[PDB]
Design a protein around this ligand. Structure first.
Ligand SMILES: O=C(O)Cc1ccc(N2C(=O)C(O)=C(C(=O)c3ccccc3Cl)[C@@H]2c2ccccc2Cl)cc1
Length: 123
């Protein structure tokens, strides 16, 4: 059975650059997918979108809209030390956190810093 690590690697293989907001979205998809035993359907939706000609970025977004565990779901809160622990390619995608962020509206995750600061990662 496909593991979260393997799915991450498969999805990363299709992405340009590294440590981008789409890479973090892969991590969030794999994490929530693993916790809901849904890695198989996520992988199948990913492959199906690619096979139709969608960009890998669009395929990842379509997963957040097509796989029921992501529908109307809040972004995971991720505790970190400083803004530095966030990858360089994500820095310009960080925003103040909106009242009710949703993954299927492009809010990938909420980073929670040590001092109480919080930032939402937006696609
Ligand atoms: O393979 C699995 O069993 C599923 C899995 C487990 C952990 C990760 N993560 C990391 O290893 C990691 O560094 C996570 C981050 O989102 C992160 C991104 C930047 C800085 C610090 C962190 Cl902790 C990231 C992570 C950690 C906590 C909550 C959500 C996520 Cl995506 C992803 C998938």
């Amino acid at each position: 059975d496909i593991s979260a690590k393997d799915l991450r690697n498969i999805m990363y293989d299709h992405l340009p650059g590294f440590g981008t907001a789409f890479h973090q979205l892969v991590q969030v998809i794999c994490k929530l997918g693993k916790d809901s035993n849904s890695l198989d359907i996520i992988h199948a939706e990913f492959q199906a979108s690619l096979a139709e000609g969608d960009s890998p970025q669009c395929a990842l977004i379509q997963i957040t809209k097509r796989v029921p565990i992501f529908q109307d779901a809040a972004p995971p809160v991720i505790h970190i030390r400083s803004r530095g622990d966030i990858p360089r390619a994500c820095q310009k995608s960080l925003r103040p956190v909106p009242p009710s962020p949703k993954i299927d509206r492009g809010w990938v995750c909420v980073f929670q810093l040590q001092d109480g600061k919080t930032l939402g990662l937006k696609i």
